[PDB]
Amino acid sequence: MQSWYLLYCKRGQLQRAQEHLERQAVNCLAPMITLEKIVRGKRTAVSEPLFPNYLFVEFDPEVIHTTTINATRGVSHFVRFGASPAIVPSAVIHQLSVYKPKDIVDPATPYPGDKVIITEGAFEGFQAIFTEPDGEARSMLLLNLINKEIKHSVKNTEFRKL
Amino acid sequence: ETLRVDPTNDRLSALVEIYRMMRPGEPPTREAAESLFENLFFSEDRYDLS
Amino acid sequence: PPDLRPLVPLDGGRFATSDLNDLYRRVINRNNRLKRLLDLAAPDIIVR
RNA sequence: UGGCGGUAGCGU
DNA sequence: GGAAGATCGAAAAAAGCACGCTACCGCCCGCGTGGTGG
DNA sequence: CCACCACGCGGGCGGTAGCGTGCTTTTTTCGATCTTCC
């Protein structure tokens, strides 16, 4: 009788919504993947939810009504196609359970030997090659001069991705 | 004549119909319908005749 | 063109964003999110 | 020194 | 004698609601998150 | 160690629901009869 639903949650409130739904005694699921991020200047590895702002909740409407899940202090709404809320088949849940990926993540790609555009500092608007993360604050690029490119480490916030 | 037109013939059917009319797009359940009807009119929280 | 949706200065360090700029920002954000989601091979329900 | 939303007012 | 055209009223959705002018008020993304100075 | 000056991703807002609510005219659709037949 228990069934699965897709839930769209508010921005930056997935953990609180998940805790509340656990307090509602319903099953919760959200993919979790760790990776390196810029983190406003510190290229550190943290865990972000795959398919952000999406939760998969297993429960029974007869036991606990849908509107209770809708207004559980952190749930933006139900992902609904038509009048009734959408029902996700168990095959998708089974696939997501064994879903163990490895991805690069596009906007956090200061990878070694990768093209990066510097738009600040003495090398503003210049294309260079990230080649190794020097510590955390000041990543290291082959800064491009008119003659050639030279090893140099400058602040992470100076350059963005091409 | 209105009773003849009315298709519902029981309290549960009437509650389901009024719940569907009040909140479309949600699964009609007896508990939710009865709670909605009770809280709509006979509850002091959001209904209050001055 | 930008001049048809200008950001008039507010002489207070802020700018008055027009509704067109906000709508374009919404469209750009949603398009980027959809591209990222389809790049990650999201399930059918999420993609829809 | 640019826009709107609300309010009030003038002439019809 | 059941299916397709008629129609028929009943309901639902869209667009409009004068012109100039003047003055004041309020705002010009909000919010969870973060770093820094008193 | 606590108040307050940025900040950068989302979107109805807020809440373990509900909020709406004193117009007229024109156009479109739809259930319900109907009706008319092949």
**Other beta carbons less than 10 A from residue C8's beta carbon:** 9
Contacts of A50 in chain C (CB under 8 A): 40
Residue at A161: amino acid letter: K
Quick one: CA torsion of B18, B19, B21, B23, rounded to 10 degrees?
Answer: 160
Q: Residue B36 has which token pair?
A: 């909605």
Question: What's the distance, CA A4 to chain centroid?
Answer: 23
Three-state SS at A132? strand
Task: Determine the distance in angstroms separating the CA of C43 from the nearest CA of chain A, rounded to an integer.
Answer: 7
The count of residues in chain A is 162
Q: Are B8 and B15 in contact (CB under 8 A)?
A: no
Of C39, B31, B46, C46, the closest CA to residue A95 belongs to: C46
Whole-angstrom Cα distance, residue A14 to residue A8? 9
Work out the angle between the directed axes of helices B30-41 and B11-22 (0-180°, nearest 10): 70
Helix ranges (H only) for B1-50 are: 2-5, 11-22, 30-41
Three-state SS at A77? strand
Whole-angstrom Cα distance, residue A59 to residue A85? 13
Residue A56 exposed, middle or buried by CB count within 10 Å (0-12, 13-18, 19+): buried
Name residues 30-59 of chain A within 8 A of C (Cβ). 50-51, 54
Whole-angstrom Cα distance, residue B8 to residue B21? 14
Q: In the beta sheet, which residues pair with residue A123? A: none
Q: Residue B41 has which token pair?
A: 């009119």
**Other beta carbons less than 10 A from residue A37's beta carbon:** 17
Q: Are A109 and A129 in contact (CB under 8 A)?
A: no
- Resolution value (Å, 1 decimal): 3.1
The CA-CA-CA angle for residues C34, A161, A102, to 5°, reads 55
Q: In the beta sheet, which residues pair with residue A100? A: none
Q: What is the DSSP letter of A65?
A: -
Residue A130, sorted as left (phi over 0), alpha (psi -120 to 50) or beta, turns out to be: beta
Whole-angstrom Cα distance, residue A121 to residue A119? 7
C8 touches chain A (CB under 8 A): no
Inter-chain contact A85–B25, Cβ cutoff 8 Å? yes
Q: Are A54 and A86 in contact (CB under 8 A)?
A: no
